[PDB]
Symmetry: D2
Subunit: 467 residues, 4 copies
């Protein structure tokens, strides 16, 4: 998913709309925008579909105010309620959330038993809003001070487990934003000076959101850190986690994040290029005695990666596939992709793709290369084998739907009908990313090695999540 | 506005939809339905427009549950009912009427409970006052006595008129009525089979008939109803000094004729209105010559028929109301009514309308009769002069827009351009209605005499309302 | 179905919209409007649904022009149009009984394709085909009337039409039997500018402030040029006035004047006739109250109560709002105080399938009524209508093949009585005795158009 | 715009939907499909918006038949102003068109004055449909023979002027398709053998690929195609002096890279464009020092890669295209479609490569985006030559009064867009770049560059215009 919040001095409805559009790649199932008008009342608009579908003219006019947050959903269901969520007591709080709680079932029971707070959905973003809400509910003075809010967030970080990048608003106070104690989910802080007296603030899941609005990049929101921006335009920061550490989602760099984004001081584009350098060198070694004629990227994530791989192997780079800018319904990847036949005929081709989950896409893309007249079809995956399920925001097939589960490269290869299959090495992937910011010692790579940094996941929770 | 709530053992989504459709006359501006599904979670759908527009197939599929409440609003671009709060327990409420101390109540909710009110609707205020009272208990689940206690404390807090219906998660449906019994609310039951019994409440009895529910009785003034999730019915008075002062205007116009409010058939009442207006015309207009009595559809159709009987004159359909009415694009009573030319030609006509508020409609209708070739046009209002604003759930123009305000009958006659004008006496009206149930000794007729039963209506508020 | 055409000096999009609303009772299935702008082009908007739902603000801005026509269809929509010759659009209320023959001729003789099943597109093309035979420009009034006269010789059945021709003006005509209603109205702005309009009922004329001129005579045609000139002419051989009798019974508006016959006054007379018959044939009948079934039979049952000397009371209340059902009680509600322990006389305007009556009678007993009797304002309906009236098949008609008692027994009534055909006729004829013979095929099975009987004769030849 | 026509033995609604989608790049303003059902009747669905928006499930179920045509239109009112159009007489004819008629006015008059046929829209597609119809109206037999139809198209070609690639259907006959005498607008023919042979035609070969049709050839300039309801194929030359003058801008920008237009791979052509441009920069920009070559997504991506290869400089993605753009609500910057990767500009002499310059608006903003990103000197290379003239052969572009390269020389344009350096592709180099993939193409349609219009009526009307000045 993708979130965004703006504490401005002027109407921010169009701004959030534009910000979400550059973040539309993080979720396309639903979208939402909530603002605070001149009467300290929430204006909400949220539904299913793309941002351009959800927000029509009449909706934007209703979304008055200089402060507001937005959210775009990556499914998990789809027919369920979308974010941001809202509660009237205390004060009136709204919250958008990117990530996943691992003890949501435990928290839902506490909120009812200990607070008589009802949770109407299966979204753990509503659970998060209420956990944060019940803690704010313990104060009885007004207005709240920054320390009360930071105390509430600190108390929330003790109760909840998992990964979360959050942004929220409180009526008559301002905007808050915080990151989990592991820095798994991305979150950046921005700034924009209108004049010497007025400065706007915004947070977003990616820096591209900051860029497209003309917001000056400040920095990443630190792990376990919380931001608070009063409606007077004042910035308060505070460490609200006990033992914070930078374990950024590695797969953000591999695929999900935008290439022109900078996450934890790491250029997504550069790191992604470095992935090609690693994978290219590995291919030069492991496939030394194989004859390859051309490197053909599977658009669009693997384009710059495949280019570097070609640079290493000294082979030519060629646009063998074309992705259609638009796609239609069927009231079958050959509707997204089309093979430039002249680039496959009587050639040994190396296809480069970002990853392999189920193996369905890969099998078909290989068929297309052969139907185009390719002698041999070799495939390379920019990311290592994906054998374990993510529980930090990335939703994926059950561990059994994964083709790499209980299988090895040669078996996975034979199923997808490739002459050769080669995965990126997890350590090479780490080095490729670490090269841009060595301060980062360990990433979050559960989908690869099955090691969860939160330390609270068993087969029991995994079995549960399936149902 | 119109309200409905059904506590049954079957999908009530369709039954509430049908219930609101027979109540659609009570409000066309907005509609809402909320239910409690098998997982004890609220399913909500509410928007602007008519019931037929608001609820499409996909919405009905969502509204699962064996218990729910409905609402149809009479005004406008604001948020509609029913409203919902997730804490405590999870409550929802639909309300018909008005709170005269809503501003006071909104302050208390904020300063004392930190509960934010996001809407100008006092139905959200009434929802939060109630929720805040249920908040004082610390056990679970609640007993019938606790719910009744909270409703009692509510009545001691809120002023004005109100008929409500609500749902508390894991408890059941509750419904109550203001101490003065101003706003309509009836209780009904249906025996599906010997083992289980369904219950429902609604604004008028026609909703009970439509669904096939047996009419039990009117909800007593200040009384509260509580149907558990197990179908157990609880009843208890929650006001200190209950009185039956039903809205007189429900009888004059707003309620359907086949409805029985407080043991009074609206139809039988409106006949008696014609009986006493005809008798009044017989004496005070004895010398005048009229050739025919013509009703202005459709409330006065049976009233004018009675007036015709008493006068011994012919009753003829002179006006026809267009069953379909369209828009007037920005790119007037004639688009709703049409004169049967033959019925007016060379005749002294007596027009019978249900009321006179602004006086605009009356003027145009008289002019239509003139264009239709009428020598003289006399207008008889089935209701007394309207001089004072209603603060109990009836939307009307400011006291200044009322033509009968600060004027006398003949002054009104000249402006609307009639040769003769006569109103029914307020005491004739009361007798006409009381003759169906002599038990009721007093009515809510502040729009006629300016006597406010709650007594808590002072100047300033009356002048504040014009905002 | 209902049609309207306006030839004015000012924008008519709103006017046609308002006219269609008061005619909305003639069709709720679909609606369409087409106008001609200053560039002499057709602006069209048509789709399924009510008039209020079909035309939104964005459509009305497209419907520019001082002339145009509208249509509401009783369950592709109208109007249709063709580009050659000149550009012709047409809306039609009625039905063609030789549509298959006409469709065959248009293809073999003129190479004109028909893409829909609507005989409005057929009628439009027959008319357009005739206009194609002229090569001079502009066409004159005589040319157009000849084209309409030629059409009347080819087509068969009942029809009230309104049409427009690019760069010429509006035309409207009526079938040789005057079965489907069509009226003409005017409206003076100044002495040199006069607007004209035509419609299915006079209520459309009244609602717009147009002066009623006269019924369009059977077989007659109307023509209004762009310059606002009126031409009339008889375009049929041996025209006759055989207006639809059922228009007066139900379909038409009570405040409409069809062929100089007030629909309202007509429906009163029917009650007078039906009330007098009950006094004679049901002299032993013991009823406590006369109850109408909303909304057509209200002023009929009122008259029936007068003739019987019994009281009249609103026993049923129809819901003003339609309610969809997902995957009669919905529209009618019984005032259970007017039935309780009473012998009631229910008055409905007609019985077709017998479904509505049966359930309504059950609703009467449910309300505690002792005996439920049923009077029908219209005679037994035993035959199909092929003249532009949507009714279920003859196989679904309950009165067909069954007698009065058997009918009464299927709907479960203690008493069933029908209006007599001749009594009904006199009721309507009393308003305008110049009308000798009505079109009432649904009742007696007599079809006035001569084309229909020969069709039977050729049907018999196939049975050999 | 884009067109497609399928003549098969199975339902073609989905097939045309899939075809229009891969041609969606040729026009996004409106779309329309029309088929002939079992009853030999026309089923039509057309309205404004993308293909995916115009065609919902309820519209797809009504589009029954085994033969039909589709259309996508670029931005021009009503839904009846979209294609295809349709006339009920004679026979029943529908037609979809990609191009532009240079004598639409005189054709509107002849149709009215001579045939009494009314034109209701501003689309000359409706004009083209009525011209072809009135010619078919001269015959008095049935059914028409393939020879009769071809004769009608021939007479049509002698009447109309301009550029066009059409596909049409005639009730009870089959699918017709033809191309203008100059072969300006593209059109390709394909087949599919299910056991019976299906046939389709489309603007680009990619439509054939995505549906699994085998590629046969380009429809020849002035040639016509006729496919009957029974699946018989006819071809005929209906132009008197047919010549191949393919639209040069198809290869530059508008055509899909994986399409083969007139035996020329669009992708190979653009690579060659990068070659010719890179070589020109190495010649005329000896001294100037750059640190990186940055393409402006997405057309110039592979072109910039080649230019960088030639220049021996690095290729880096300085700009990223927003794949989702939204509405800007009243109550238009290029930042909505483009974002800068700040790290790739900072303290560098960048060479930007855009496919073209029309108004100079986009270029100016993109140059500033580079400047604020940290770039020292920003150079701009255009894959296409100066655009100095309006296109009247079916290409949609701003009014000729907005063309920055008109009456202005390169250095004037450079300081208006605020570039440190500006360079255009030479038309001769560009022509050699495309003609290298198919030397038998001698002359292109590049009127937007040289102001040379291959159709004589244009140059003739120009002199008639000059006469009005006196
Ligand atoms: C060109 N880029 C595409 C996007 N790719 C991935 C992206 C992805 C999303 C979530 C995730 O979390 C675990 C991991 C990866 C998948 O959507 C698809 C397709 C594709 C590659 C492998 C998969 O196809 P599959 O192998 O399951 O059939 C190609
Ligand atoms: C045919 N029935 C209509 C309903 N009537 C009333 C109904 C009404 C609403 C609120 C109320 O509380 C004060 C009292 C009455 C008004 O809607 C209209 C029209 C009408 C009568 C007098 C008024 O017209 P106005 O005098 O303001 O121009 C006719
Ligand atoms: C009071 N409003 C309705 C008037 N009625 C008629 C009107 C009608 C329609 C078509 C027609 O063509 C021959 C003749 C008459 C029918 O719509 C329905 C319902 C109704 C009564 C008898 C019929 O129901 P049915 O007998 O088929 O069950 C009630
Ligand atoms: C990166 N892809 C776009 C392709 N471009 C062209 C495409 C084009 C359209 C019509 C035409 O008439 C023959 C020639 C070319 C123009 O749309 C725009 C924008 C752009 C580049 C130069 C122009 O910008 P302008 O200077 O007009 O503002 C960027």
């Amino acid at each position: 998913c993708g979130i965004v919040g703006i504490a401005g001095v002027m109407p921010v409805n169009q701004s959030i709309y534009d910000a979400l559009t550059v973040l539309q790649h993080r979720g396309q199932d639903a979208a939402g925008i909530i603002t605070i008008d001149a009467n300290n009342c929430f204006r909400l608009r949220k539904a299913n579909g793309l941002v351009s579908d959800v927000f029509e003219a009449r909706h934007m006019q209703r979304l008055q105010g200089n402060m507001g947050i937005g959210h775009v959903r990556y499914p998990t269901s789809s027919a369920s309620e979308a974010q941001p969520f809202y509660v009237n007591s205390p004060y009136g709080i709204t919250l958008a959330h990117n990530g996943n709680l691992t003890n949501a079932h435990e928290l839902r029971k506490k909120l009812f038993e200990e607070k008589r707070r009802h949770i109407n959905t299966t979204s753990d973003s509503e659970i998060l809003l209420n956990i944060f809400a019940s803690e704010l509910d313990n104060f009885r003075h007004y207005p709240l001070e920054a320390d009360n809010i930071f105390a509430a967030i600190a108390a929330t970080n003790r109760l909840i487990r998992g990964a979360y990048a959050c942004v929220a608003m409180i009526i008559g106070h301002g905007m808050v934003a915080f990151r989990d104690p592991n820095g798994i989910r991305p979150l950046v802080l921005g700034k924009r000076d209108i004049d010497e007296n007025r400065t706007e603030y915004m947070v977003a899941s990616e820096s591209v959101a900051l860029d497209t609005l003309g917001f000056d990049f400040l920095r990443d929101v630190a792990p376990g850190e919380a931001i608070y921006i009063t409606e007077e335009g004042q910035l308060f920061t505070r460490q609200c986690a006990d033992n914070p550490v930078s374990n950024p989602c590695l797969f953000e760099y591999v695929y999900f994040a935008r290439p022109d984004s900078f996450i934890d001081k790491i250029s997504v584009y550069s790191a992604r290029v470095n992935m090609g350098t690693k994978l290219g060198e590995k291919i030069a070694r492991e496939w030394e005695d194989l004859d390859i004629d051309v490197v053909i990227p599977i658009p669009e994530t693997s384009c710059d990666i495949a280019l570097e791989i070609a640079r290493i192997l000294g082979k030519p780079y060629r646009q063998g596939f074309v992705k259609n800018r638009y796609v239609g319904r069927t009231f079958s990847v050959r509707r997204k992709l089309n093979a430039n036949r002249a680039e496959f005929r009587d050639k040994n081709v190396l296809l480069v793709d970002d990853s392999i989950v189920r193996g369905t896409t890969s099998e078909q893309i290989i068929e297309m290369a052969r139907e185009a007249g390719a002698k041999k079809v070799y495939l390379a995956s920019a990311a290592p084998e994906i054998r374990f399920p993510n529980v930090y925001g990335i939703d994926m097939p059950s561990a059994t739907e994964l083709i790499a589960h209980g299988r090895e490269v040669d078996e996975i290869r034979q199923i997808i009908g490739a002459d050769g299959l080669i995965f990126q090495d997890l350590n090479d992937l780490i080095d490729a990313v670490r090269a841009e910011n060595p301060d980062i010692q360990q990433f979050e790579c559960s989908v690869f090695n099955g090691v969860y940094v939160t330390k609270d996941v068993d087969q029991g929770y995994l079995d549960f999540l399936d149902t």
